[PDB]
Design an enzyme around this catalytic site. Structure first.
Site, mmCIF file in Angstrom:
data_model
loop_
_atom_site.group_PDB
_atom_site.id
_atom_site.type_symbol
_atom_site.label_atom_id
_atom_site.label_comp_id
_atom_site.label_asym_id
_atom_site.label_seq_id
_atom_site.Cartn_x
_atom_site.Cartn_y
_atom_site.Cartn_z
ATOM 1 C CE1 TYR A 22 -34.939 16.438 -24.657
ATOM 2 C CE2 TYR A 22 -34.222 14.356 -25.633
ATOM 3 C CZ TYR A 22 -34.281 15.748 -25.659
ATOM 4 O OH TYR A 22 -33.655 16.430 -26.683
ATOM 5 C CG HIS A 60 -36.064 5.697 -16.449
ATOM 6 N ND1 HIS A 60 -35.024 6.565 -16.191
ATOM 7 C CD2 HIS A 60 -36.799 6.273 -17.432
ATOM 8 C CE1 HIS A 60 -35.122 7.617 -16.986
ATOM 9 N NE2 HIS A 60 -36.189 7.463 -17.749
ATOM 10 C CG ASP A 78 -32.733 4.324 -14.759
ATOM 11 O OD1 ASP A 78 -32.989 3.751 -15.842
ATOM 12 O OD2 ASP A 78 -33.196 5.454 -14.445
#
Ligand SMILES: *[C@@H]1O[C@H](CO)[C@@H](O[C@@H]2O[C@H](CO)[C@@H](O[C@@H]3O[C@H](CO)[C@@H](O)[C@H](O)[C@@H]3O)[C@H](O)[C@H]2NC(C)=O)[C@H](O)[C@H]1NC(C)=O
Ligand SMILES: *[C@@H]1O[C@H](CO)[C@@H](O[C@@H]2O[C@H](CO)[C@@H](O[C@@H]3O[C@H](CO)[C@@H](O)[C@H](O)[C@@H]3O)[C@H](O)[C@H]2NC(C)=O)[C@H](O)[C@H]1NC(C)=O
Ligand SMILES: *[C@@H]1O[C@H](CO)[C@@H](O[C@H]2O[C@H](CO)[C@@H](O[C@H]3O[C@H](CO)[C@@H](O)[C@H](O)[C@@H]3O)[C@H](O)[C@H]2NC(C)=O)[C@H](O)[C@H]1NC(C)=O
Ligand SMILES: *[C@@H]1O[C@H](CO[C@@H]2O[C@@H](C)[C@@H](O)[C@@H](O)[C@@H]2O)[C@@H](O[C@@H]2O[C@H](CO)[C@@H](O)[C@H](O)[C@H]2NC(C)=O)[C@H](O)[C@H]1NC(C)=O
Ligand SMILES: *[C@@H]1O[C@H](CO[C@@H]2O[C@@H](C)[C@@H](O)[C@@H](O)[C@@H]2O)[C@@H](O[C@@H]2O[C@H](CO)[C@@H](O)[C@H](O)[C@H]2NC(C)=O)[C@H](O)[C@H]1NC(C)=O
Ligand SMILES: *[C@H]1O[C@H](CO[C@@H]2O[C@@H](C)[C@@H](O)[C@@H](O)[C@@H]2O)[C@@H](O[C@@H]2O[C@H](CO)[C@@H](O)[C@H](O)[C@H]2NC(C)=O)[C@H](O)[C@H]1NC(C)=O
Ligand SMILES: *[C@@H]1O[C@H](CO)[C@@H](O[C@@H]2O[C@H](CO)[C@@H](O)[C@H](O)[C@H]2NC(C)=O)[C@H](O)[C@H]1NC(C)=O
Ligand SMILES: *[C@@H]1O[C@H](CO)[C@@H](O[C@@H]2O[C@H](CO)[C@@H](O)[C@H](O)[C@H]2NC(C)=O)[C@H](O)[C@H]1NC(C)=O
Ligand SMILES: *[C@@H]1O[C@H](CO)[C@@H](O[C@@H]2O[C@H](CO)[C@@H](O)[C@H](O)[C@H]2NC(C)=O)[C@H](O)[C@H]1NC(C)=O
Ligand SMILES: *[C@H]1O[C@H](CO)[C@@H](O[C@@H]2O[C@H](CO)[C@@H](O)[C@H](O)[C@H]2NC(C)=O)[C@H](O)[C@H]1NC(C)=O
Ligand SMILES: *[C@H]1O[C@H](CO)[C@@H](O[C@H]2O[C@H](CO)[C@@H](O)[C@H](O)[C@H]2NC(C)=O)[C@H](O)[C@H]1NC(C)=O
Ligand SMILES: *[C@@H]1O[C@H](CO)[C@@H](O)[C@H](O)[C@H]1NC(C)=O
Ligand SMILES: *[C@@H]1O[C@H](CO)[C@@H](O)[C@H](O)[C@H]1NC(C)=O
Ligand SMILES: *[C@@H]1O[C@H](CO)[C@@H](O)[C@H](O)[C@H]1NC(C)=O
Lengths: 726, 728
Positions: free
Chosen positions: B593, B702, B670
């Site tokens: 994010y 990730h 990912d």
């Protein structure tokens, strides 16, 4: 003193080379495609007429990217809705324009998503492939005759090649060959049932929510290969209430004993076809000569009439065994083969005699046979001035081999040392195409006396544009590595001064039978580098190089990643000692096989190179396609060559990359040299703690040729090179 | 003399924070593994004894990745052949060791590639999942009983969650819950038949000739979601019927009306289970309380015991509805919910009364309920000093809510402001874990008087080593905007001089309910950048951040990619105004994010930032999973919120990247934020001819947490930051 040739000039194609692409429609005329129409020219006088103004379709409703006139001149095949696949393959919609009535055919049209189309060699018959099956139309507006019914996506290919045959064998998507007058339609069938699939993600436009997975039957070294069958159908016999009958031509037994490939098909007469097969271990091939038999209805290939072509020093042929050129009666033929000394020359054969007679000889080679008449055999070679990187058209008198005439050597020696040719249907006329070292020059000639009729395109315009720019020059010379001489070229910065020291960039490829040092004129990235950044861009042809005999070319047999990489370093080493070369600023770069060699050199610990760029490199041979890899490496088994297959990877040299600056680039949708190859290189560098630079290009393939990506990669590489050199 | 904290110090883990991980096996004892010998301690006196000797399992032929002793302590589950999957999931091989006869059990072994194994909460029953089906073992050496026959790869999951339920709904892999005494086994069933698959290549070791294609059922924003069903089976009937029936508990009707999720399940008593359901439009949630009907053998949920929890300004819960904590008798429970002032506090519920009674204060929030006894309820909150980034353990008197005590606040105020806790089985004892601002400190206490029994670990070793290095300092404070305070933190170079102008790196995340400004002590990359490179590394918690009330957390509802982004830009401006920052050398970086925010900022045209680095960023919300994305963005449809979905992509701002130096990084494997996201960013940049830097990491997920990959990315980022700031 005038501007330089900048990166933008190259990327935007400011200075464009003019060409003259013609297509002979007979022994006397040829078509000339233009921007707004198509004209037919009379070779004798030079006068022309309009065949159609294209505006004929201003309201066709579609953008036409190509036209194809029946050899008949009565119909025009209009191609649109074009969608590229691999290097040669693609799909498209097709419409036919009837020139007799000047009206579009509305009935029984070619299906959308057609994979391949081709007019017969003489009238207006058509053979096309849709959904992997073959179809034949005798008349443009009549229903098609379904020739094959077994076609199945990714499994059975009829009339078209699979990925590996398209790329490494025929260099074409077509797998069908019409007989001289159109009577028979020969075709191959490929079965990829057990061939493994390479899979990779394709992201597409931003709007696509989920990435799609592309899967294509692709045999990597040692994997299961596609199998092949060959058939011949009589297009004058096809019924309409009965299915077409295709006759199969099989064997040779010496081929059926194991894995093999169909590597060449050439019709000899209206009823005689020749086929060349190659064993998976590519140092043995056989040519079959088959004749039609009306009474039995079969195609007989008499033993004793076949010819074996093998090699004890390497593989057969430069990339594959050569194409034969049959005499008029088809009872004899000429074809290029490696002579006793290892040089490729023209050998004369009789279809039923075992040994052939070489009609050419010497320490140089024939590039290709371009035309054959009862009178002469026309060919291209690099004999002139003993320059392997130059090419000229010659003719040898078939009655007296002692009478060989060079037809292009003397036309304009200063400007032209590299030619290609295009003969009219019966070789009454020929168009010469000079491509270096000066600007391209296209000319027309008549064979009877080799008179130079007229200049077709001389690029006078462009020449006037470049006189206003500080263009670099090209030095073609050689160095000697113990006994043997090897050639190299240098793109030199404007106003080159041997007193000054310039940074040097080694532009490399170096794959088997490659040639990077020649007399061809090019407008590329290297031009910008030397013209604007004053960087010398050299190229060198060492062991493994082509057109200089098998002793040189086969030197890396079963040993890729060895002599060609060492010679590249040795050359660079001698360049650094030159004096006008700054030894502290020497770089290297290459694409594909060139990326492989660039990566291998950088991981050699030579200490000669400061930085290097590898684009879409091969990293380990077990990842590459079978046909190409095995040709040079054999099979990756312990009984054969597994050991060297394991000793020649890039990742094994990772530790050595700590001494240089590396830039690794690869397109994610590369169907040829899989992105996998570079992903394994970066992982090996990471595991050894080697820092490097990287750039991936999403959805770009082996050519990284989309307009924006093309511009981006060169821009990115330029920053890298000047950063390294400053 | 005295060196600084170097990159290598960080990458080689030279200075290690000692921990004290314990596992309560009763109300009086706990197990403590010492890498070789796992011994057991007596909370009361601190004396220990070896529970399992070091060599006990040598010659096992395998490396034991983990141990798990059954509740009655008669058997131990040996976990080996570990193979990680997603964040919590992983497959492995298992062996059970009989402690009663010091024998390794070799009969009816748990299958290899078993997906999940769990002991009953009492005794030694076992429940495991293999090939997506649930199996139960009453006795360790006896044959298992199959519970489900619907298991199907990438299609039907029994007893385990699919990808999105693991990562976003439960934040846990397991989807089965044993009843307190182990009689019943509750479990959920996920059907992903219609759920689209995310596919990507995995290259593996060099030896793999053809890359493998990984395919995972993964619902992206607006796509089809998995469906769920809930069942309860009585394990005590397994040895009597041949095929015990799994009783389904469905509804609520208010939930069945459309797409929904099962978000929580907790047993209240031996015969009472509570289930919380959430509508796909996560502004509405319902909790059912179902009792076993000994008569009809069914499970009934009275509507009078149904509790609704909705939100008018945002979604429910911080990330999902809050977990209930039932009183011993199961007739009432406590639960954290936002009060009328938008602050999250604990309120008391009676199972059949809809109005709850709040028991805690106001201008701060309860972080979580940690334990419940007959006398008190223990919880963690950020009330102390009004510091939203601090964490302390309190206890409130159930008979008089005005009586609240803080048990950690005063232990060591200078060194400890961030606590977590672990209570013994009956809350008789508890271990306190202080994680900042000083070095970690572990202490053990007895709940009778909250007396500190002893120090388990004070990191004295570490303390010594660090006095020999020029360590950076940390400042935690706030700034006031539009009359609302926003907290930030800065890692300052040694010998900080407010008269000098330092280059600054804004470390960002800024996702909904995130908190990047706190009191935690960390030895990370920022430590190196400050200590060695003399760079100030700062973080700012702007609108959308959490633990400060819904007024601030819901500020980005249905509007991701706005305020949250603008506030990071303002923070840099505000820091610049402080006078000790070089306006010409301000950079920004983030992960996930944080990558999205970094990217949106670099393409904003601010011209506040010179360079930036985005790691595994989200580029367009339509590519991220449905549960997380829709919670804050609603549905990507024209009737709902599609316009903002399309207006908030990183690609639409590519042109603006010409004015900054950008470094984009992403792992190719990912499974969370798909490589696809960065693939579309690079393409957008290529399309407008903007140059930038890039780095893919083959087969990293990730986390890009492999040892080599970890060292490599931080080494690469350092070269970039240093070059951008003209260092060293
Ligand atoms: C998981 O959810 C899927 C829904 O996507 C369920 O699949 C559906 O199962 C029903 C079975 O009643 C299928 O209906 C049947 O269709 C066949 C046609 O081939 C017909 O002959 C039968 O009479 C019946 O109507 C339905 O087609 C199928 N839908 C899909 C998309 O596959 C599946 O049952 C669920 N599994 C579990 C364990 O809940
Ligand atoms: C234990 O009991 C369960 C629940 O009855 C059994 O599962 C059920 O097994 C049947 C048959 O294998 C499944 O198939 C059904 O087939 C019919 C006819 O083809 C069809 O109309 C149905 O739609 C269904 O496909 C049935 O779906 C399945 N139901 C459940 C909830 O699992 C299980 O087989 C039993 N185990 C043993 C060992 O007997
Ligand atoms: C294309 O090439 C295929 C083989 O590569 C041909 O097939 C043949 O080989 C398969 C094995 O792949 C044989 O067996 C299949 O069926 C059995 C039983 O169902 C399976 O056990 C086995 O795994 C295979 O799926 C086939 O029997 C054999 N074909 C025939 C006709 O005998 C395939 O025929 C060929 N296609 C064409 C058009 O030539
Ligand atoms: C090109 O022109 C020829 C005619 O050229 C003229 O006649 C030549 C003999 C010579 O004297 C030239 O210098 C003259 O300009 C065209 O030939 C005619 O072709 C048509 C059919 O194609 C035929 O019916 C005529 O009899 C031919 N005329 C002659 C004199 O032979 C030729 O067609 C022209 N080609 C094109 C493409 O326009
Ligand atoms: C830890 O040691 C205790 C022994 O406790 C002793 O007596 C206390 C009053 C105090 O003086 C301590 O310092 C002494 O060590 C062990 O307790 C025994 O537990 C068993 C049951 O397991 C019980 O039957 C014995 O009576 C207990 N001993 C006494 C003296 O009462 C305890 O087992 C030890 N635990 C570990 C893990 O070593
Ligand atoms: C090949 O397709 C074109 C375009 O048709 C559309 O696209 C196709 C891929 C498929 O999705 C069709 O269902 C679509 O209708 C055909 O061209 C015609 O186009 C007109 C208007 O553009 C449309 O009304 C017709 O339905 C289309 N097809 C026909 C048969 O009329 C084209 O005809 C197709 N090729 C052949 C040989 O039929
Ligand atoms: C020509 O051969 C094809 C292929 O065998 C025949 O087409 C198939 O016929 C069968 C039987 O009617 C069908 O089930 C198939 O669907 C047809 N298609 C294919 C691809 O197999 C066709 O019938 C033959 N025609 C004649 C005149 O013999
Ligand atoms: C194209 O070639 C075919 C094959 O040689 C020719 O067809 C033959 O014609 C002769 C007539 O002299 C017949 O006796 C043969 O039976 C035919 N063979 C076949 C296979 O049909 C055909 O004449 C040629 N086409 C043209 C226009 O010359
Ligand atoms: C064509 O290549 C094959 C395979 O490399 C050659 O046969 C092998 O030759 C080597 C020695 O050079 C032997 O060790 C192997 O046992 C041979 N057989 C195989 C299957 O490997 C063959 O000699 C080559 N042909 C020519 C004409 O040189
Ligand atoms: C714990 O499990 C159940 C909880 O329901 C306890 O109660 C028995 O439950 C079964 C239903 O599964 C009833 O048939 C019995 O009548 C219940 N017991 C009594 C005394 O009524 C059960 O006793 C407990 N089991 C264990 C092992 O502690
Ligand atoms: C929770 O948020 C949703 C947003 O989708 C609200 O859904 C509907 O009601 C809104 C207020 O009446 C409308 O403005 C929305 O258009 C409508 N949404 C759709 C997709 O039609 C829902 O009411 C909210 N719940 C609460 C209790 O406020
Ligand atoms: C001869 O030259 C080759 C390449 O030019 C080199 O590898 C070799 O070392 C030299 N000497 C011998 C004996 O081969
Ligand atoms: C697990 O796999 C190993 C290796 O294949 C095998 O030896 C062992 O018996 C298996 N165990 C079980 C319970 O299947
Ligand atoms: C005032 O609005 C918010 C607080 O509500 C603050 O973060 C922001 O910086 C200020 N101005 C703008 C335009 O957002």
């Amino acid at each position: 003193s005038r501007k330089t040739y900048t990166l933008t000039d190259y990327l935007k194609n400011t200075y464009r080379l003019k060409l003259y692409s013609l297509r002979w429609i007979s022994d006397h005329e040829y078509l000339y495609k233009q921007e707004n129409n198509i004209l037919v020219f009379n070779a004798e006088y030079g006068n022309s007429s309009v065949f159609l103004e294209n505006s004929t379709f201003d309201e066709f409703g579609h953008s036409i990217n190509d036209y194809s006139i029946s050899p008949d001149g009565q119909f025009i095949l209009l191609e649109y809705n074009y969608v590229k696949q691999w290097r040669h393959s693609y799909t498209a919609s097709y419409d036919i324009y009837d020139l007799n009535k000047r009206q579009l055919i509305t009935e029984e049209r070619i299906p959308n998503n057609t994979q391949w189309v081709t007019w017969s060699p003489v009238g207006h018959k058509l053979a096309y492939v849709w959904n992997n099956d073959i179809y034949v139309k005798i008349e443009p507006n009549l229903p098609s005759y379904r020739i094959t019914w077994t076609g199945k996506e990714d499994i059975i290919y009829n009339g078209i090649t699979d990925w590996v045959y398209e790329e490494e064998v025929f260099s074409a998507y077509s797998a069908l060959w019409w007989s001289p007058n159109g009577t028979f339609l020969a075709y191959a069938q490929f079965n990829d049932t057990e061939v493994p699939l390479i899979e990779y993600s394709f992201y597409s436009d931003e709007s696509l929510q989920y990435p799609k997975t592309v899967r294509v039957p692709y045999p990597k070294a040692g994997a299961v290969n596609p199998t092949v069958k060959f058939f011949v159908v009589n297009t004058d016999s096809l019924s309409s209430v009965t299915n077409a009958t295709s006759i199969q031509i099989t064997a040779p037994a010496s081929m059926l004993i194991g894995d093999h490939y169909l590597c060449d098909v050439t019709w000899a007469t209206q009823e005689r076809i020749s086929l060349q097969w190659l064993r998976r271990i590519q140092n043995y091939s056989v040519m079959d000569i088959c004749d039609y038999d009306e009474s039995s209805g079969r195609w007989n290939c008499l033993v004793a009439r076949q010819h074996i072509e093998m090699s004890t020093t390497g593989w057969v042929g430069r990339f594959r065994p050569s194409e034969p050129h049959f005499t008029l009666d088809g009872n004899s033929f000429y074809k290029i083969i490696s002579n006793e000394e290892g040089y490729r020359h023209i050998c004369y054969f009789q279809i039923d005699k075992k040994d052939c007679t070489f009609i050419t000889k010497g320490t140089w080679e024939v590039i290709g046979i371009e035309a054959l008449t009862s009178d002469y055999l026309y060919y291209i070679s690099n004999e002139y001035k003993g320059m392997p990187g130059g090419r000229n058209l010659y003719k040898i008198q078939l009655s007296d081999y002692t009478k060989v005439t060079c037809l292009s050597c003397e036309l304009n020696p200063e400007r032209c040392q590299y030619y290609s040719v295009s003969f009219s249907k019966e070789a009454k006329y020929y168009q010469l195409r000079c491509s270096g070292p000066g600007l391209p020059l296209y000319t027309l000639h008549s064979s009877v006396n080799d008179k130079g009729l007229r200049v077709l395109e001389d690029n006078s315009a462009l020449d006037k544009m470049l006189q206003n720019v500080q263009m670099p020059s090209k030095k073609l010379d050689f160095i000697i590595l113990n006994e043997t001489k090897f050639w190299y070229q240098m793109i030199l910065p404007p106003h080159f001064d041997k007193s000054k020291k310039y940074p040097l960039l080694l532009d490399v490829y170096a794959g088997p039978c490659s040639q990077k040092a020649d007399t061809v004129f090019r407008l590329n990235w290297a031009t910008y580098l030397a013209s604007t950044e004053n960087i010398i861009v050299a190229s060198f042809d060492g062991r493994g190089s082509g057109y200089q005999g098998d002793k040189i070319m086969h030197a890396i047999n079963r040993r890729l990643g060895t002599f060609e990489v060492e010679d590249q370093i040795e050359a660079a080493r001698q360049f650094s000692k030159m004096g006008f070369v700054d030894n502290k600023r020497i770089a290297i770069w290459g694409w594909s096989y060139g990326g492989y060699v660039t990566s291998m050199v950088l991981g050699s610990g030579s200490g000669v190179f400061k930085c290097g760029i590898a684009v879409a490199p091969v990293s380990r041979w077990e990842y590459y396609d079978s046909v190409y890899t095995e040709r040079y490496m054999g099979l990756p088994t312990p009984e054969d060559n597994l050991d060297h297959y394991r000793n020649s990877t890039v990742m094994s040299r990772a530790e050595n990359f700590k001494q240089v600056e590396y830039l690794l680039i690869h397109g994610t949708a590369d169907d040829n040299v899989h992105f996998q190859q570079s992903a394994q290189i970066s992982k090996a560098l990471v595991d050894v703690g080697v820092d490097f630079q990287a750039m991936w290009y999403t959805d770009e393939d082996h050519g990284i040729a989309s307009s924006t990506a093309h511009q981006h990669i060169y821009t990115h590489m330029s920053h890298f090179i000047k950063q390294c050199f400053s």
